[PDB]
From a paper:
Iron and manganese are essential nutrients whose transport across membranes is catalyzed by members of the SLC11 family. In humans, this protein family contains two paralogs, the ubiquitously expressed DMT1, which is involved in the uptake and distribution of Fe2+ and Mn2+, and NRAMP1, which participates in the resistance against infections and nutrient recycling. We show that both proteins catalyze selective metal ion transport coupled to the symport of H+, but additionally also mediate uncoupled H+ flux. Their structures, while sharing general properties with known prokaryotic homologs, display distinct features that lead to stronger transition metal ion selectivity.
Author numbering: 92 to 562
The structure:
Amino acid sequence: SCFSFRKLWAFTGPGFLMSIAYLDPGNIESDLQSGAVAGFKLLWILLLATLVGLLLQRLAARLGVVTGLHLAEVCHRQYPKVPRVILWLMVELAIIGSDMQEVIGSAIAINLLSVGRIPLWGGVLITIADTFVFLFLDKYGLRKLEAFFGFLITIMALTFGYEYVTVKPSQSQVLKGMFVPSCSGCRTPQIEQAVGIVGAVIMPHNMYLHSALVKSRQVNRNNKQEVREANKYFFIESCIALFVSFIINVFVVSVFAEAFFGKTNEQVVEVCTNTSSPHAGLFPKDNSTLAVDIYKGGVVLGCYFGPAALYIWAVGILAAGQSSTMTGTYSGQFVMEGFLNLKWSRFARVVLTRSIAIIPTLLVAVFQDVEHLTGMNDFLNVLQSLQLPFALIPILTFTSLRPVMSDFANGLGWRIAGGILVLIICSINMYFVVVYVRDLGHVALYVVAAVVSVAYLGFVFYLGWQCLIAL
Ligand SMILES: [Mn+2]
């Protein structure tokens, strides 16, 4: 048949987890910074990042279907023993960074629900209970969790939808920002946050997860018709999931763009004092523009539109953090199953990720303040943008070789588009790393920074050289 919902319902199950995977708290933070630094003018790059992320997720589905072994397994079989462990360690660092960003977001939301009675370290300690939830799930062995993901999308959609309905932003301006590429009056940190959003939307570890979830569906690899049908339907399912995630991201960008774009500190301080909520001394009184965090965004939202919008924003961040936790556990489990061949349970993986996440975050929370936590969040964002090439390259390298894919290699346009995509991404990363290095200027710590930079560039050059051999 050409297309039918009867066959569409059979292939369901990867779609919900892929949909929640694109709305971790880091994605909401990237949209949050997008909606105050630049407003609507830098919304089209969200659509571009979502479109190229799907067009990469379909390659993940193709690698999953045509050969039953998912992306971590074929990565184990293809590359040698030396770079396999290094690429695995960089993927682990990316997953740990995502889980640490989750811990920051969940700690901020736990602090913000309770009206500040719970300290930040209290929220970071309260985030440990996800591990005990995973213990109870393994013990009882539900092993389905689709209803969770559906309820998660339900609560997140109704939260940010209530935010959008309350603020009532202009659809003409948001569509103008959406479909007309134009960034007038640009400034170099504005393009820095542009690279931040394009690096944060394409999460690095989603491929491995999508390939493994596609592998979970039984399918005859030899038969061509079932292969093509399952491949195209997983592509449509990923398209629907990414469309829903893109709509929620657009809601976040539009609400923060219309509400607090360009509002100086005096206006928000006067309005929030008129509201009489106790959270007023956080913002200074000076001519500068409003700086928004996951916390400070919630405070300005509460002081503008009452406590209901604040609690809805915080519970939305909590649901997004739960999504990032579950996606991190699943992707990490398949990564350890494939790369170095350890059949670790979900509980051991969540203990590893959550412990390495909470130790620096508990230190920073119990010592330093919320502004340094958001600075660490920005550091994790630029880290995720740094880790983007290790997801862009190897999938393109593996699902184009004729021996591994049989007759389902990529066509000429797909390969050349991937070539220009890898070239623009690694050139952006090289320029951004030297931009970050030139500020440093130290006698010695400049040297170890240069050592890290040249090591990373050598590894990215090796992967790109392997890809150009493959293409
Ligand atoms: Mn992330």
